[PDB]
A paper describes a structure:
The reaction-center light-harvesting complex 1 (RC-LH1) is the core photosynthetic component in purple phototrophic bacteria. The basic unit of photosynthesis in purple phototrophic bacteria consists of a type 2 RC surrounded by light-harvesting complex 1 (LH1), forming the RC-LH1 core complex. LH1 is formed from curved arrays of αβ heterodimers, each of which binds two bacteriochlorophyll (BChl) a molecules and one or two carotenoids.
The 2.80-Å structure of the complex that lacks protein-W shows 16 αβ heterodimers forming a closed LH1 ring completely encircling the RC, hereafter referred to as the RC-LH116 complex. In RC-LH116, both the RC QA and QB UQs, which participate in electron transfer during charge separation, were resolved within their binding sites. In the RC-LH116 complex, the QB quinone is located in the fully bound “proximal” position, but RC-LH114-W was resolved without a QB quinone. In the RC-LH116 structure, three sequestered UQ10 molecules were resolved (Q1 to Q3), all of which had clear density for the entire tail. Q3 does not appear to make specific interactions but is located in a hydrophobic region between the RC-M subunit and LH1-α subunits 5 to 6. The gap in the LH114-W ring allows formation of a continuous membrane region between the internal space of the RC-LH114-W complex and the bulk membrane, rather than connection of these two domains by protein pores as in the RC-LH116 complex, similar to those of the closed Tch. tepidum complex. The 880-nm absorption of RC-LH116 was redshifted by 3 nm relative to the 877 nm band of RC-LH114-W.
Residue numbers in the entry:
A (entry chain J): 1 to 45
B (entry chain I): 6 to 52
C (entry chain H): 1 to 247
D (entry chain L): 2 to 277
E (entry chain M): 2 to 307
F (entry chain N), G (entry chain G), H (entry chain A), I (entry chain C), J (entry chain E), O (entry chain 9): 1 to 46
K (entry chain D), L (entry chain F), N (entry chain 8): 4 to 52
M (entry chain 6): 3 to 52
Write the structure that this text describes.
């Protein structure tokens, strides 16, 4: 599996991975915040 | 690639680590105070 | 995403488009940096590491040419980084002053690039920029003025020479240059058509970039029937210098 | 801070006002005196919008709005809290646009190129001035300008449009829409053509302008050329804005505010060739 | 410096150009070719030759079938009078089917002719797309033009085919007429709330405005540096001259960033293609997903409850 | 079967495959969240 | 772990980190300020 | 304070000063006309 | 603190500072003139 | 901690710091002015 | 030399003049603020003036 | 040399002056905040002020 | 050098003579037309109407 | 020639003709204004209509 | 023998002077036309 780095530049791969991860995290957070059961700030209603 | 010597990289890493850790400590104290002001994470029926 | 919930399909689609558009902007700004990088640091800055900006310049790109050769961009050999200029002040962002003659040094608005010293070859390996006397089958559409014979005047009313030929572009039929014989020299120079007003005074050609007595200094061509890209760029820059230094 | 080829161009001279005092760069940006002036105008306008928003009910980006004065003030000066902020923001915006154009003129002079870009920006400045100055004056009051809001000036556009029957029957409006759509078509064509000539099929050399002429002579039977396409692009993009400005000038000042554009076209239906 | 490059001063005339020889697998071109003096004042003077093969001829035949259907219905709606036809030509149309027939094939005088004309026009447009792709491939060039055309085709299909499908009725489509289709546009906006509050409509308008802005900017820039040989955009990329250097430095000193001789055409391509794409998405969402755009805008804080 | 990689360069194919799989997974998750029976956050009664 | 600084320029990394952190903090503050419970300026009224 | 003309060039300072003063006078007059008490053309509003 | 003039040209720094100060003064005067209590021309709204 | 100036140019970091601080102060002052409790010019009802 | 292009002597001279001018500016501003407070005080109470 | 282009002596000098100015700024801001709290307190209870 | 327009002095004077004669005839005919139009219905009413 | 393309004597001739034509334009305009004032005087009495 | 036309070029001063003067005249005439008391075209708006 260590050969993937012979296929992709580690710098570009790492930057793209971090950007993808942050985007996914913030999107999941906002989806949870949009609901009513899992809204942790003002609560359910 | 970056253009940094190995010693420069190690020194930068040490200073970066200590700065990050102090920032984390300050943030944790801020969060303790913020929870003391108003807790989040309500119950399923509200606050 | 259920009916009645706050989340719905339209706003999900909108956020998908926002993410795609951020990606596209990054791709476009990445493509924008294939010429002129890395940057040249100003005065009072460190020169140990390169400045490239946050969208990093992409890897060099290779184009396949007609004969079988290749061309790798960025073209680092076209930059001319060492010219006759001196800084007008020690702080960053200060303009430069020409140390010598800006018409002959190629600085400022009279600056040219170090292009390849060969003519553009066209689709049959024959030069495309050609005098009308060497392009069999082309003429000048008699409905328009015939510049051959008209005198040429500078920005100061002085006559600098006369028009003897019109250099045309084959495969893109257009008049690109006029051949000018200087007043008292029997020598020939080129004048770009976009720099000249044919028939501004009824029987003359007006060039308001350089003074009439400066046509003697226009760079010349090696051969009398073809021009290279470097010579074209130099001839254009010479007239461009007069826009700021003719006084 | 300079591109790899930029140093030989950063020479002194070519200003209009101020001499060599403002003849420097800040990063990539040239400054001049008009750069200072335009940043000043922009910052005053932004601060005024922010102050007008603090006096309002919300900070929502989509609902911010700076409303023009009431019609009871005519063409005079309104109190700052009841319409004057709109007038001062309009003044600041006009100043910023004019100074931007003049800075572009200075850059053109320093580089030694033609003045086509500031001339083309003057058309957009003219359309803005027609919308906020000329038409409100010909109508009688500043209350006819549009609000400075992301979604409130769209409501202004729709109300103004429905104030004349159906705005689609405005003939200058039709010509302007035709020019806009043609501009989009030509931009797509030109971009795609240059890209396909520079990035050819797999295993091919880079093409030439003869291939570019040939492909459109094979498609539609005519090709305009490399200088012709740029001339035509400028022409179309400027004609669209000219005819939109004309479209708005004749609506209200010429055709009354309660009239209908569909009924103008009846001049064609009443020609004596077929009218009775 | 005083000569603006708007009009050609002196025109050069030579023999007609036959064209680059075609890759094997294509018919021969035509030979009729002429020159026009006025077209040469702004651009090129040669007119022709044209290439017609199978796809172009079939495209023209189907398009003329559709045009003939539309015109014969317009003449029948006016009792075949040519005087009354010319009197009101922009007010005539071939109406879409009636709402009571769903997606079936309606009677001829209630939607059948409209459906047949739409079918033949769609086949014509698809054949022209194939022709663009084929003519581009026959010279070894890329296919960017046909993939830009595909976006306009997609907006056309969304307006006429996809949205009626998802709504389950042919009556949701525009008529074939000059003023009637403008009336259809107005009524479509009125029927589904206010189309100003459709965010993809807003994005499409932004991209149309940016297309005009960018094409004005590019035309003005290329005309300004044409004295240094700037209009040869292909040779200026393989061998950078001073014209493109000045062009890039103008916009760098103006607004902080610039492009290359090639990437600006990518900006152009993308801003032109993104208008009909966002438009098609917004049209597909209108009706099937959202039926009142002002209520959507109020729900998401675009406007006060009003 | 390894001959497929004599036609497609592995890097481009792999990038395209990852984009395709991610988009498909996103679409399936959102379709499931759209319904009433398989909504796993708020539950039934849509 | 120190080897990550042989890959990326530390200047651009620090500028990116600072911009990212400031944007995140400003967004979190604005999100809290637009709620009723966690609005510390005018209070829990609205 | 004669030393100011060692740092600046009077021929340009005068132009800048005159333009600034003209703009400031314009601003003040425009602001005065905006009011009811200090409007010297129509006087107080109804 | 005099070392700040080894990094910045005093002429252009001074003119930029004056421009900044003038803009700030104008903004504060507008803000005060736009209120009701601190309007020094017409007075309170009432 | 003085080593931060072996990485960044002090002269431009100082200008960037000035700009950032002024922008932040302006934002905070407008936020305060927009509220009811902390409006120090006209007072509560707003 | 220096990035500015000045020597220590010129820098100290300009700094002295700059401090003097800044201080006169601050003094005039303080007087203006005292006068403005005597005209109308700000910072009301939680219930108003 | 160094990435910035400075030496250690210049770095330390600039850092001394920077730290001094930053600390004066911080002190002034702390006093401003104490006065602002004396004028209005913030952080209300869950039921208002 | 020569003329900025291309016409010599003789051609210029001839064109000017013909131009002046034509302009004068135009003005005379216009004056007669205006006298007749005034005789038909005058303009410039009093401040209260006709 | 020169920047414009004219000599000094040519410029003086141009200026003489320009001045005399502009003067005739101004005098006929003044006559027109006198007539117009006699028809409908602007600047009327305290409240004119 | 006034040196003012020795350090300051007249042909460039005159055009800018005339621009400013013409603009000011236009501004004043507009301001007067847009009022009820000093509108000389018709008069008051009744
Ligand atoms: C709701 C509102 C929405 C709209 C908001 C609009 C906001 C407009 C902001 C305009 C100002 C932006 C300035 C950015 C400068 C960044 C740095 C720089 O020079 O980059 C060069 C760089 C290009 O060169 P590069 O090779 O990529 O990078 C070189 C390096 O930067 C290294 O280059 P260098 O070595 O030359 O050093 C550069 C450095 C020089 O060194 C310095 O330290 C200079 C001293 C100043 C430092 C700090 C400068 C300012 C930092 C950012 C401040 C941002 C806020 C400004 C105020 C905003 C007020 C509202 O900095 C500068 O030159 C700064 C110049 C300006 C001062 O990037 C650009 O030029 C970017 C241009 C962006 C233009 C504005 C685009 C705004 C968005 C448009 C669309 C908006 C849509 C909104 C839709 C809303 C809903 C409908
Ligand atoms: C429930 C279903 C779920 C499905 C799974 C999930 C969704 C999957 C979606 C997949 C979409 C397509 C993916 C593959 C695209 C390949 C494009 C390509 O190779 O372009 C090469 C092209 C470069 O080509 P080149 O180097 O100029 O020329 C190469 C050869 O010399 C010249 O070579 P050539 O002449 O053979 O080609 C010329 C070139 C010309 O360039 C293009 O065509 C590229 C632009 C494509 C536009 C497509 C328009 C489609 C219009 C509607 C569809 C057609 C309707 C009508 C059909 C005909 C009717 C008669 O065209 C192509 O290479 C592509 C042909 C196919 C286009 C349509 C693909 C769909 O790439 C670009 O220019 C850049 C592309 C854009 C990149 C932007 C940055 C990333 C954007 C994404 C950021 C993150 C988004 C996150 C979203 C939210 C997540 C939650
Ligand atoms: C949920 C939220 C999630 C997050 C959201 C946000 C996420 C982040 C987004 C980021 C987007 C990209 C931005 C760039 C990030 C990466 C930068 C990078 O890699 O290097 C910098 C990079 C240049 O790299 P380089 O040329 O290699 O130079 C490397 C060195 O920096 C050259 O070094 P140098 O020495 O030559 O020059 C130095 C100079 C460089 O200056 C600059 O580069 C100026 C520009 C900076 C970047 C500005 C970015 C602005 C981003 C705006 C984002 C959008 C805002 C939208 C707002 C909407 C409002 C409605 O200054 C500094 O770097 C100073 C740093 C050190 C400061 C030290 C302070 C004191 C520390 C010590 C304290 C005391 C300790 C001791 C205590 C005592 C102990 C005893 O910057 C650029 O490329 C600039 C252009 C980038 C695009 C700009 C336009 C983007 C679109 C903007 C739209 C909005 C309008 C404009 C903004 C409006 C704002 C209100
Ligand atoms: C119900 C409403 C009516 C209608 C009512 C109106 C009204 C009212 C108007 C139009 C106008 C237009 N309509 Mg209409 N219109 C309708 C339907 C349409 C349809 C359609 C498909 O149905 C189309 C294509 C159009 C198209 C058009 C254009 C002809 C025109 C908009 C272009 C323009 O004004 O450029 C002008 C461009 C500008 C003014 C841009 C100004 C640029 C400035 C100088 C720069 C600003 C910079 C900024 C401040 C700073 C940014 C810096 C940042 C850092 C980036 N309308 C409907 C039927 N329409 C407008 C028009 O013609 O005005 C001239 C107009 O007022
Ligand atoms: C009152 C009316 C509504 C309104 C109702 C609509 C409706 C409905 C639509 C738009 C659409 C658009 N509107 Mg709108 N729009 C309004 C106000 C505006 C204003 C304005 C200033 O007020 C502007 C600038 C616009 C502009 C726009 C564009 C962004 C967009 C059109 C894209 C396009 O290029 O299609 C033109 C291109 C095509 C239609 C594709 C061309 C198809 C093929 C390529 C052509 C084949 C021709 C064939 C061969 C010829 C022979 C055929 C036979 C002769 C028959 N609208 C108001 C609010 N608008 C469209 C959109 O996509 O938005 C979501 C759309 O459907
Ligand atoms: C990027 C989106 C924009 C766009 C792009 C675009 N349009 C395109 C293309 C592209 C990239 C093409 O390649 C294609 C084309 O051929 O352009 C020259 C085309 C085209 N866009 C056209 C029209 C068009 N585009 C429009 C819009 C837009 N096109 C968008 C704004 C509109 C509008 C606003 O309503 C119209 C009316 C055509 C000129 C052409 C597609 C021609 C076609 O499909 O023909 C079908 C044939 C018939 C209907 C038969 C009847 C004959 C004619 C009535 C049709 C036109 C024929 C003529 C163009 C060529 C004839 C040559 C002869 C020698 C045979
Ligand atoms: C009573 O009513 C009628 C009208 O009066 C109201 C009319 O006025 C007319 C019209 C006639 C006139 C009076 C005008 C004069 C015109 C003519 C004289 C021409 C006569 C025309 C006809 C009689 C019929 C014309 C039909 C044609 C030209 C072909 C039709 C083909 C199809 C409809 C395709 C079938 C549908 C399919 C397959 C759907 C697939 C989807 C697509 C859109 C893609 C289609 C693509 C292809 C099939 C081709 C692909 C080709 C490729 C890839 C290229 C391959 C490589 C090659 C080079 C070959 C008629 C006929 C009519 O009755
Ligand atoms: C059962 C399935 C299988 C079939 C369906 C297959 C689907 C795929 C069909 C889908 C059709 C959709 C997609 C198309 C929808 C169309 C809209 C998008 C756009 C409407 C067009 C708007 C124009 C303004 C029309 C004007 C035309 C008219 C003015 C010209 C008339 C010509 C006359 C004068 C002919 C000259 C006079 C004489 C008598 C000689 O001829
Ligand atoms: C480039 C073009 C390629 C083809 C693109 C389009 C392909 C077709 C898309 C997939 C079809 C989806 O399937 C389609 O679903 C819609 C939406 O419920 C149904 O449409 C439905 O609409 C509503 C309910 O929503 C009812 O009033 C209607 O009677 C019913 O038909 C269609 O009857 C069915 O055909
Ligand atoms: Fe181009």
């Amino acid at each position: 599996m260590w050969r993937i780095w012979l296929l992709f530049d580690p710098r570009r791969a790492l930057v793209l991975l971090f950007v993808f991860l942050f985007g996914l995290a913030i999107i999941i957070h906002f989806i949870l915040l949009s609901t009513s059961r899992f809204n942790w700030l003002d609560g359910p209603r | 690639i970056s253009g940094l010597s190995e010693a420069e990289a190690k020194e930068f890493h040490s200073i970066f680590v200590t700065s990050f850790f102090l920032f984390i400590v300050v943030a944790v104290v801020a969060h303790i105070l913020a929870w003391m002001w108003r807790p989040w994470l309500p119950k399923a029926t509200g606050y | 995403m259920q009916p009645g919930a706050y989340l719905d399909l339209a706003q999900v689609t909108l956020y998908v488009f926002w993410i795609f558009f951020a990606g596209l902007l990054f791709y476009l700004r990445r493509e924008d940096k294939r010429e002129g990088y890395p940057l040249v640091a100003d005065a009072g800055s460190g020169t140990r590491l390169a400045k490239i900006g946050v969208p990093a310049p992409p890897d060099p790109k290779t184009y396949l040419l007609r004969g079988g050769a290749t061309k790798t961009v960025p073209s680092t050999s076209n930059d001319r980084p060492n010219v006759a200029l001196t800084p007008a002040a020690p702080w960053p962002g200060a303009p430069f002053v020409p140390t010598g003659n800006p018409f002959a040094d190629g600085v400022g608005p009279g600056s040219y690039a170090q292009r390849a010293d060969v003519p553009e070859l066209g689709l049959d390996n024959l030069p495309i920029i050609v005098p009308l006397r060497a392009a069999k089958g082309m003429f000048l559409d008699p409905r328009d003025p015939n510049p051959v014979g008209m005198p040429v005047v500078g920005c100061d009313g002085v006559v600098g020479g006369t028009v003897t030929e019109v250099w045309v572009d084959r495969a893109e039929v257009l008049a690109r240059y006029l051949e000018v014989e200087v007043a008292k020299s029997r020598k020939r120079v080129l004048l770009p058509v976009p720099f000249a007003l044919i028939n501004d005074p009824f029987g003359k050609v007006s060039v308001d970039a350089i003074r009439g007595d400066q046509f003697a200094g226009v760079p010349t061509t090696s051969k009398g029937d073809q021009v290279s890209k470097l010579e074209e760029d130099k001839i254009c820059a010479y007239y461009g210098a007069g826009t700021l230094y003719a006084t | 801070a300079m591109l790899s080829f930029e140093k030989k161009y950063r020479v002194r001279g070519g200003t209009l006002i101020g001499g060599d005092l403002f003849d420097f760069w800040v990063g990539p940006f040239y400054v001049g005196i008009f750069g200072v002036m335009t940043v000043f105008f922009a910052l005053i306008g932004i601060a005024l919008i922010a102050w007008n928003t603090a006096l309002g009910p919300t900070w929502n980006l989509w609902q911010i709005s700076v409303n023009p004065p009431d019609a009871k003030y005519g063409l005079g000066f309104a109190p700052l809290a009841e319409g004057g902020i709109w007038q001062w923001v309009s003044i600041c915006a006009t100043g910023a646009f004019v100074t931007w154009a003049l800075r572009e003129v200075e850059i053109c002079r320093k580089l030694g190129i033609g003045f086509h870009v500031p001339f083309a920006f003057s058309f957009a400045i003219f359309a803005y001035v027609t919308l906020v100055v000329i038409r409100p004056v010909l109508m009688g009051s500043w209350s006819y300008g549009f609000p400075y809001g992301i979604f409130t000036h769209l409501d202004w556009v729709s109300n103004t449009g429905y104030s004349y029957g159906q705005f689609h029957y405005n003939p200058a409006h039709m010509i302007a829409i035709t020019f806009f759509f043609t501009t989009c078509l030509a931009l797509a064509l030109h971009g795609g053509l240059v890209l396909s000539a520079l990035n050819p099929d797999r295993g091919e050399p880079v093409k030439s302008p003869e291939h570019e002429n040939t492909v459109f002579r094979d498609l539609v039977g005519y090709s305009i050329g490399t200088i012709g396409i740029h001339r035509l692009g400028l022409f179309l993009a400027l004609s669209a804005v000219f005819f939109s400005a004309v479209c708005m000038i004749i609506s209200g000042p010429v055709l009354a505010e309660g009239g209908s554009w569909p009924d103008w076209w009846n001049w064609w239906r009443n020609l004596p060739i077929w009218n009775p | 410096a005083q000569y603006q490059n708007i009009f050609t001063q002196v025109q050069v005339e030579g023999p007609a150009y036959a064209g680059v020889p075609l890759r094997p697998g294509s018919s021969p071109r035509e030979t009729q070719t002429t020159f026009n003096y006025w077209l040469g004042k702004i651009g090129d003077a040669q007119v022709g030759p044209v290439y017609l093969g199978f796809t172009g001829v079939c495209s023209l035949l189907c398009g003329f079938v559709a045009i003939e259907i539309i015109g014969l219905n317009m003449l029948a709606s006016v009792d075949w009078s040519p005087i009354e036809f010319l009197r009101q030509f922009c007010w005539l149309a071939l109406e879409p089917p009636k709402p009571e027939y769903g997606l079936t094939i309606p009677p001829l005088k209630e939607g059948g002719w409209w459906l047949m004309a739409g079918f033949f026009l769609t086949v014509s447009i698809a054949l022209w797309w194939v022709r663009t792709y084929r003519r581009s491939r026959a010279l070894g060039m890329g296919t960017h033009v046909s993939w830009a055309f595909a976006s306009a085709i997609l907006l056309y299909l969304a307006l006429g085919f996809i949205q009626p499908l998802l709504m389950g009725s042919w009556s949701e489509a525009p008529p074939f007429g000059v003023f009637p289709h403008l009336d259809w546009t107005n009524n479509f906006s009125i029927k589904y709330g206010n189309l100003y509050y459709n965010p993809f409509h807003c994005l499409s308008i932004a991209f149309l405005y940016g297309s005009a802005l960018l094409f004005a900017m590019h035309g003005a820039t290329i005309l300004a540096v044409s004295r240094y040989g700037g209009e040869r955009e292909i040779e200026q990329m393989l061998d950078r001259g001073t014209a493109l250097e000045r062009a890039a430095l103008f916009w760098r000193w103006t607004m902080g960033f610039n492009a290359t001789a090639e990437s600006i055409h990518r900006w152009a391509w993308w801003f032109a293609v993104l208008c009909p794409l966002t438009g098609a998405i917004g049209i597909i969402l209108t009706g099937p997903v959202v039926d009142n755009w002002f209520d959507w805008g109020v729900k998401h804080g675009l406007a006060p409850p009003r």
